[PDB]
Amino acid sequence: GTVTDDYLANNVDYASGFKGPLPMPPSKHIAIVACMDARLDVYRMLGIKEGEAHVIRNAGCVVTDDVIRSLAISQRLLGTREIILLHHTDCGMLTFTDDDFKRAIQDETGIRPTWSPESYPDAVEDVRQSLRRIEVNPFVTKHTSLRGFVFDVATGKLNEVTP
């Protein structure tokens, strides 16, 4: 038995009382960009119900070309019009640099990744930087609200940041 097995076990209970199917587009027309950090249950964090929001999470909550891609699809095909960015404190990107990280994998693997680790030092500065990354971007344009916050992994609180 692995943890994949346990989660599949857990799925049997969830499926017992699943009610659906709900309609495809987000019923509150909002999309969240979050981090993949294990301490962040993005749904309970904002009281999201099923069928309501799009949630997008990667390492560091970095607005990547996959995040733009996702977002662009989200607005243009499933009619989202709000955006919430969510970095957080004690995030796992203020501990390594890109040069360090790639050299690491280079030693083992023999090659460098083409992609960019996208680490950053200060989380708050990067909520700013990530907001900007969406401002300038020409494909995520259909939104009437774009605000980015910082999740306090010690307290559960959202602290907005000004661009």
Place this chain on the structure above:
Amino acid sequence: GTVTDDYLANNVDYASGFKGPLPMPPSKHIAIVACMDARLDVYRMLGIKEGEAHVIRNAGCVVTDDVIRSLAISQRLLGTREIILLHHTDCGMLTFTDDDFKRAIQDETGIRPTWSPESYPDAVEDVRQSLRRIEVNPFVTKHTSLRGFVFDVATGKLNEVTP
């Protein structure tokens, strides 16, 4: 006011009962690659608890360079050793091709995006394809288990797909 606003309210009542902080590395040493789809509450779907699992999401659960980047970080930095891949039935990715989408964007903006929109026509198949990408990828290696499932939006049951 807005949904962002409503969500923040909900965050207040979350931070009341919140117990933390927790340690960084996912306590059950697993990662999940999921879709951004509104109808998928991945945590409740696999019985996840705060601090256990990395959750990675995007449009259509595609193993883009972002997902590899996040997986390589998740494993190399925070020691995750199982991967769950998680497509689903009736995904937005099914109802368009890439060329059309980039075109629509151009006629609207004047620009073709640089990224591949990454649609697919068969969910069950592209699980194998997504599994196949991680398999042959030289930066996602430390994992012991790799399995892929299809979440059924109408029942809530997973359906394991095999390579």
